[PDB]
Design a protein around this ligand. Structure first.
Ligand SMILES: [Mg+2]
Ligand SMILES: [Mg+2]
Ligand SMILES: [Mg+2]
Ligand SMILES: [Mg+2]
Ligand SMILES: [Mg+2]
Ligand SMILES: [Mg+2]
Ligand SMILES: [Mg+2]
Ligand SMILES: [Mg+2]
Ligand SMILES: [Mg+2]
Ligand SMILES: [Mg+2]
Ligand SMILES: [Mg+2]
Ligand SMILES: [Mg+2]
Ligand SMILES: [Mg+2]
Ligand SMILES: [Mg+2]
Ligand SMILES: [Mg+2]
Ligand SMILES: [Mg+2]
Ligand SMILES: [Mg+2]
Ligand SMILES: [Mg+2]
Ligand SMILES: [Mg+2]
Ligand SMILES: [Mg+2]
Ligand SMILES: [Mg+2]
Ligand SMILES: [Mg+2]
Ligand SMILES: [Mg+2]
Ligand SMILES: [Mg+2]
Ligand SMILES: [Mg+2]
Ligand SMILES: [Mg+2]
Ligand SMILES: [Mg+2]
Ligand SMILES: [Mg+2]
Ligand SMILES: [Mg+2]
Ligand SMILES: [Mg+2]
Ligand SMILES: [Mg+2]
Ligand SMILES: [Mg+2]
Ligand SMILES: [Mg+2]
Ligand SMILES: [Mg+2]
Ligand SMILES: [Mg+2]
Ligand SMILES: [Mg+2]
Ligand SMILES: [Mg+2]
Ligand SMILES: [Mg+2]
Ligand SMILES: [Mg+2]
Ligand SMILES: [Mg+2]
Ligand SMILES: [Mg+2]
Ligand SMILES: [Mg+2]
Lengths: 159, 169, 58, 294, 121, 213
RNA sequence: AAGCUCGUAUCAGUUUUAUGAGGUAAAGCGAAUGAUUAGAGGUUCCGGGGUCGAAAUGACCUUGACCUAUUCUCAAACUUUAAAUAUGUAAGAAGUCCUUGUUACUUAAUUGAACGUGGACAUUUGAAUGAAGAGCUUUUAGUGGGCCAUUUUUGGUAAGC
RNA sequence: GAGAACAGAAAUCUCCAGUAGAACAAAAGGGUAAAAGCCCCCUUGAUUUUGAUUUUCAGUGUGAAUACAAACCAUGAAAGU
RNA sequence: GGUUGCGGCCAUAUCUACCAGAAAGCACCGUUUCCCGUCCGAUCAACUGUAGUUAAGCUGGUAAGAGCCUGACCGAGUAGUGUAGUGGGUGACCAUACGCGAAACUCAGGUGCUGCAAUCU
């Protein structure tokens, strides 16, 4: 018979990192989680309790609840033709603050700051991110750089 | 150089490998008691061996650890029996040494036919001061190279006092 | 007689006719499975913070 | 020692945490002291850290940050001279003493030192410091033994009794105090009281001097040099609490020389390490010494 | 750019010229007004729809394209996709569904796009 | 027994070596892989010639053997038991299978027993290597050439720019030896690094840092 | 199919930016595990068969095992490393900030925690591109033998299997 | 590995090296070292009440599991568990 | 800058060998009446800081040192790979177009950083 236990196919997913087995460092237990925090889910197979099912490995979601030893996390999950709402009880050992949100908050703090120093000058801001643009015209010089000119190479076995 | 590190007998452990359980083994222990002044400890068989006739977790052998001036005294009594000569064997690379005697009455000790006659092993282990470094709970550590006991060293020790002979090689 | 056993062929086509959407979204979302004591106290912090506002109308 | 470590071994060898190697931190037990009920967020767990060296007694109150442990206040036995304890600087009575000083001192600086008196009476009885209804709650602190054995009658539980009686809330139980008879499963507060005042020490002095004029005169050389009579010991400790609860405040030491001053001498005994340039110069000479078959 | 890439076997593109743009917008310019594809035959229509961003003429439309610039987005979106014919003259190659570098059509043919468009225009 | 090579010439299946899950395979038909003067010093045979696969297939053990013999023999009669070193540079690690039909069973339960071994061999991948003295180039090429006829697919024959089985262009090899950076050993040879511990680096290769010449 | 609530919105089989997850391809084996060719030096003072005084608790021997540094070659159910393609999340009014309200939760603590009052901030208000409108309910037909191609891929010698 | 009367390949007694090459009922995989392994001490959280959740899923059942709430307990100096 | 206590990241920190270490600290160390634990006051417990010593631990320095880290137009734009073709080829397989792109290898640099509190020529 086929075999579809709970931790199937997770031989390498829940392995520890090479030369990173053993006690989980204290940092992990000192990070504080509030509701509305966006957490990254990544199981640690030494902490067997509060484990995320293998689906949620690699998935980010928001804390809806905070408890003695675990956060509750909301995950949107597609089944069939629609996302369903999913509530996960994960111990903190399997959870991490999502850096991408910190890029965002820090940018929001930037964009309020930029906006001030412009009304304090009544000038214009230009606050939206622009994407990487073409390139403007340049004049490269030949001073100390007369173009070495290359040509294709003969065939030659080295074995 | 040579101040601290004066090199001494850490402990002496006498063994009688009786090899069977019951009266013979209670009797062998009593000897070790009647000698060490200590209450000795029984050893259990690590595994069943049929040609020797021992079963797993059977009480087979008894030993007692002696330290301090007593063990220095029971060492001599033995040394006395081996006529103050040992072999360049006996001395382990790590600095400890040992020997064995047949017949325990040969070092003091009345006879007492309700106790009979046992022989016994004599392993004495050597250290210096500063060995608690390897033994304590907190900040356990390893001795330094230019410290710590060896066989060259604790053979010459053995000759210097005891006025002894170590034989062969 | 033997027949085909399984396939996901055509299934994402089917799922994507009028499907995927997103998940439905609300401020004041469900409080399903939140710490019961906290809810209990939240209950009270609300009644109070209500009250106090009607007191500020006379 | 020709048990050489195969380069394989070394390569996939995984070092313990630094302070594990040092045999200082029990990380299994740390994780449980430090960890907060996540729904108390940045409510710091506070630790009563009590360590003994061979000549001193350390008492810190610590909380944990990701970037490091932080101390609210620290007290020592080597402060105790200022408060009248000159000898026996690592015995039980100095442990209680040091446990008291830290108590008074922290929760002085905290502000709850007028409220939460403590005991003042001290018959060494078992009791925690319950909070005053219609008021604050006491500064709660959890003992941190570290690596010390839990033996009944241990020095480290002196500092505990010192701190509890100081009016810190420090959860505990009797059965590791001197006085705890395990047949009885009861505590004889006379023994515990005695210990606070160095009873077990004083007695021995009396037994010694009578029985051994010579040993005593050696073991207790400095009680002689200062005429500390033995049965005056209690009054040293009793008086010392007085002055402790009196002025619990911390005063530093008067330090000759400034930080830089020390430094610029205090390890220009440091061995300065070569530059790769010189190093190569050493390499190329060493050979000529060794080159030529021998 | 990463879009173009994704789509490169199915399209043929390059760098247009005032000429090609001028004639594309004149001859085949239709605006988007409440869906409806409306032909730009009088300047009023652009100004009624693109005036808010400046642009009250057809050459105002053109300029805002060739220069890209600020309301290109809304200018260009206004412009209904151009319905070109098939190339009068031919594709100039045996098979079109290789790359321009390989012997014809599909991919960036750069400032060759003009000769192409003009024959499809 | 033994169905044609044609039934197993292509790398159609993930490698299936003998393993704790595949115990009970028979023994490879080729067992010897080094022969000729296999103990000869690195200096003796400076010339190296290779029999190179130009396809991507599988070579049976039995091919390897058959070709090995046909190589060794022709080499020895024409220049002798000690005039070359022949190294079979490819091992038959992979197991072929037979389903094996004995009314009849059918395509049900078609998983096969082990049938024999082969070597999954690549484009460019060396098959045979030979080392000799330069004055045996042509006798060597024909050893290999005679062997080609025993192997499925186009396999090329190439003159190595290498001093024997070592690496290093022949010129770069002679720099090193006449510098004393090279020390003999079990038929192969060790090299002097500028990496390890100085002491036992000079006790291993005295000749390098020395008066001498 | 019936519509209903609305009306540019929140949308998307897409890119970008930022930040996650992964152990396949490749790679590797003088790195672990498991395989595998070859010598070389050293061991036994603790397996051995002899010759030298039957001598041997003694020598030099070939021979195993073991050790050291090399060497040729491998893995769906080995691996340090480790892609490409795919894949999670985020890119703001349900936001940001300041003031200080509630509570029985929590704190040594008007400390926190949640939810608020009041005040301030709308040109690009927080990337791209598109939008043929978005949202939503009810109900019912058929169907529930499939097959083919490129690519990935399992069994089989293979197959229009 | 080096050492100790009878003691032998194998009894029991030291010391040194030792990242796990061991052990953890069982298949295999993951996980673990002042432990999750070995020895000891105290124990009945293998308990009481009904909810929420994760997997398989129709997001039905069943199994198994996870995190709280409200009791009553066990253990420990304690945090805790 | 030393040193200690509690730490963070957990080898640039570990391994091997040799030296060096002012001052303070830490340590080894002295003792066994007392609470307490041992076959053994060795560990554990208590006591003195008194009799001693930097020998060891610990701290640094050395080493064409083992390991580990960092880099590099070092190998290699290679291997692998997304997309394309009525491309080559009997096939096995390969070249080209638009893209992404490693491992080993080689060489080069490096060998703990750091928070809180205390203390020191
Ligand atoms: Mg299966
Ligand atoms: Mg897999
Ligand atoms: Mg470990
Ligand atoms: Mg469980
Ligand atoms: Mg017997
Ligand atoms: Mg049927
Ligand atoms: Mg069929
Ligand atoms: Mg069907
Ligand atoms: Mg079926
Ligand atoms: Mg190496
Ligand atoms: Mg503990
Ligand atoms: Mg008693
Ligand atoms: Mg036309
Ligand atoms: Mg014409
Ligand atoms: Mg025509
Ligand atoms: Mg043309
Ligand atoms: Mg036939
Ligand atoms: Mg197949
Ligand atoms: Mg079957
Ligand atoms: Mg079968
Ligand atoms: Mg592969
Ligand atoms: Mg690799
Ligand atoms: Mg291997
Ligand atoms: Mg397979
Ligand atoms: Mg997507
Ligand atoms: Mg848009
Ligand atoms: Mg229907
Ligand atoms: Mg239906
Ligand atoms: Mg139906
Ligand atoms: Mg067992
Ligand atoms: Mg298992
Ligand atoms: Mg056991
Ligand atoms: Mg049950
Ligand atoms: Mg004792
Ligand atoms: Mg002692
Ligand atoms: Mg002690
Ligand atoms: Mg030490
Ligand atoms: Mg190195
Ligand atoms: Mg096509
Ligand atoms: Mg083709
Ligand atoms: Mg054809
Ligand atoms: Mg290719």
């Amino acid at each position: 018979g086929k075999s579809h236990g709970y931790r199937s196919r997770t031989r390498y997913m829940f392995q520890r990192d090479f030369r990173k087995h053993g006690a989980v460092h204290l940092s992990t237990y000192l990070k504080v989680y509030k509701v509305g925090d966006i957490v990254d889910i990544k199981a640690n197979g030494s902490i067997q309790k509060g484990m995320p099912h293998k689906f949620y490995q690699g998935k980010t979601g928001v804390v809806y609840n905070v408890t003695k030893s675990s956060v509750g996390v909301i995950i949107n999950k597609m089944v069939g033709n629609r996302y369903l709402e999913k509530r996960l009880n994960l111990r903190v050992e399997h959870i991490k603050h999502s850096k991408c949100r910190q890029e965002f908050l820090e940018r929001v703090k930037a964009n309020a700051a930029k906006r001030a120093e412009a009304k304090a000058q009544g000038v214009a801001v230009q606050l939206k991110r622009q994407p990487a643009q073409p390139r403007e015209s340049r004049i490269v010089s030949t001073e100390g750089n007369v173009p070495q000119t290359l040509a294709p190479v003969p065939y030659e076995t080295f074995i | 150089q040579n101040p601290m590190r004066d090199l001494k007998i850490e402990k002496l452990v006498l063994n009688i490998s009786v090899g069977e359980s019951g009266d013979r083994l209670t009797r062998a222990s009593k000897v070790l008691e009647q000698l060490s002044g200590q209450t000795p400890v029984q050893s259990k068989a690590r595994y069943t061996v049929r040609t020797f006739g021992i079963r797993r977790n059977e009480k087979i052998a008894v030993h007692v650890t002696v330290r301090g001036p007593k063990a220095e005294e029971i060492l001599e009594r033995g040394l006395k029996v081996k006529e103050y000569q040992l072999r360049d064997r006996n001395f382990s690379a790590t600095g400890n040494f040992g020997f064995g005697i047949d017949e325990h009455i040969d070092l003091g000790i009345k006879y007492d036919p309700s106790i009979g006659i046992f022989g016994m092993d004599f392993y004495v282990v050597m250290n210096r001061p500063g060995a608690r470094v390897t033994r304590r709970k907190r900040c356990k550590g390893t001795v330094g190279n230019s410290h710590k006991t060896t066989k060259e060293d604790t053979v010459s020790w053995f000759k210097q006092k005891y006025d002894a002979d170590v034989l062969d090689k | 007689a033997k027949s085909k056993n399984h396939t996901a062929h055509n299934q994402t086509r089917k799922a994507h006719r009028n499907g995927i959407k997103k998940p439905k979204t609300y401020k004041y979302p469900s409080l399903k499975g939140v710490d019961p004591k906290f809810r209990r106290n939240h209950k009270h912090a609300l009644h109070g913070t209500a009250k106090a506002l009607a007191a500020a109308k006379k | 020692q020709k048990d050489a470590k195969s380069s394989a071994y070394s390569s996939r060898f995984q070092t313990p945490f630094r302070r594990r190697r040092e045999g200082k931190t029990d990380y299994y037990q740390r994780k449980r002291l430090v960890t907060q009920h996540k729904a108390k967020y940045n409510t710091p767990k506070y630790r009563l850290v009590v360590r003994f060296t061979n000549k001193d007694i350390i008492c810190q109150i610590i909380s944990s940050t990701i970037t490091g442990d932080v101390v609210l206040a620290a007290a020592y036995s080597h402060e105790l001279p200022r408060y009248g304890i000159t000898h026996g600087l690592t015995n039980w009575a100095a442990a209680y003493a040091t446990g008291l000083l830290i108590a008074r001192r922290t929760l002085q600086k905290l502000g709850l030192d007028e409220t939460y008196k403590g005991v003042e009476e001290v018959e060494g009885e078992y009791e925690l410091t319950e909070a005053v209804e219609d008021g604050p709650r006491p500064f709660k602190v959890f003992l941190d033994i570290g690596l010390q054995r839990t033996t009944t009658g241990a020095r480290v539980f002196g500092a505990l009794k010192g701190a509890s009686d100081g009016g810190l809330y420090v959860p505990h139980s009797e059965n590791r105090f001197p006085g705890w008879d395990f047949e009885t499963e009861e505590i004889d507060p006379e023994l515990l009281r005695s210990y606070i005042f160095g009873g077990h020490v004083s007695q021995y002095m009396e037994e010694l001097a009578d029985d051994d004029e010579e040993r005593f005169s050696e073991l207790f050389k400095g009680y002689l040099a200062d005429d500390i009579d033995a049965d005056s010991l209690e009054d040293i400790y009793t008086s010392a609490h007085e002055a402790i609860r009196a002025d619990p405040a911390f005063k530093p030491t008067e330090k000759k020389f400034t930080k830089e001053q020390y430094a610029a001498e205090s390890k220009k005994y440091r061995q300065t390490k070569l530059s790769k340039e010189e190093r190569a110069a050493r390499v190329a000479a060493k050979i000529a010494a060794l080159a030529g078959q021998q | 750019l990463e879009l173009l890439k994704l789509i490169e076997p199915y399209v043929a593109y390059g760098y247009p010229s005032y000429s090609t743009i001028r004639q594309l917008v004149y001859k085949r310019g239709f605006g988007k007004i409440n869906k409806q594809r409306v032909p730009l035959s009088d300047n009023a229509i652009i100004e009624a729809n693109l005036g808010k961003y400046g642009i009250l003429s057809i050459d105002d439309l053109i300029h805002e394209i060739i220069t890209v610039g600020p309301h290109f987005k809304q200018a260009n979106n206004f412009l209904w996709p151009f319905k070109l014919s098939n190339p009068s003259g031919g594709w100039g190659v045996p098979r079109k569904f290789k790359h321009f570098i390989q012997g014809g059509s599909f991919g960036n043919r750069e400032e060759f796009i003009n000769k192409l468009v003009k024959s499809m225009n | 027994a033994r169905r044609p090579a044609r039934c197993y010439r292509y790398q159609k299946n993930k490698p299936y070596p003998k393993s704790r899950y595949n115990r009970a395979v028979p023994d490879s038909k080729i067992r010897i892989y080094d022969l000729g003067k296999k103990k000869a010093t690195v200096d003796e045979f400076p010339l190296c010639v290779h029999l190179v696969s130009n396809e991507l297939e599988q070579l049976s053990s039995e091919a390897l053997e058959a070709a090995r013999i046909c190589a060794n023999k022709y080499m020895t009669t024409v220049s002798g038991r000690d005039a070359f070193h022949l190294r079979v540079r490819v091992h038959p690690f992979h197991v072929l299978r037979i389903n094996k039909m004995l009314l009849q069973q059918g395509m049900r339960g078609a998983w096969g027993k082990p049938h024999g071994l082969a070597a999954r061999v690549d484009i460019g991948q060396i098959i045979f290597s030979v080392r000799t003295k330069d004055s045996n180039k042509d006798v060597v090429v024909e050893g290999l050439r005679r062997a080609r006829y025993k192997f499925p697919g186009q396999q090329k024959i190439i003159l190595s720019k290498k001093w024997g089985f070592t690496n290093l262009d022949r010129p770069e090899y002679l720099k090193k030896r006449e510098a004393g950076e090279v020390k003999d050993d079990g038929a192969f040879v060790k090299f002097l690094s500028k990496k390890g511990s100085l002491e036992n680096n000079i006790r291993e290769f005295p000749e390098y840092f020395a008066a001498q010449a």
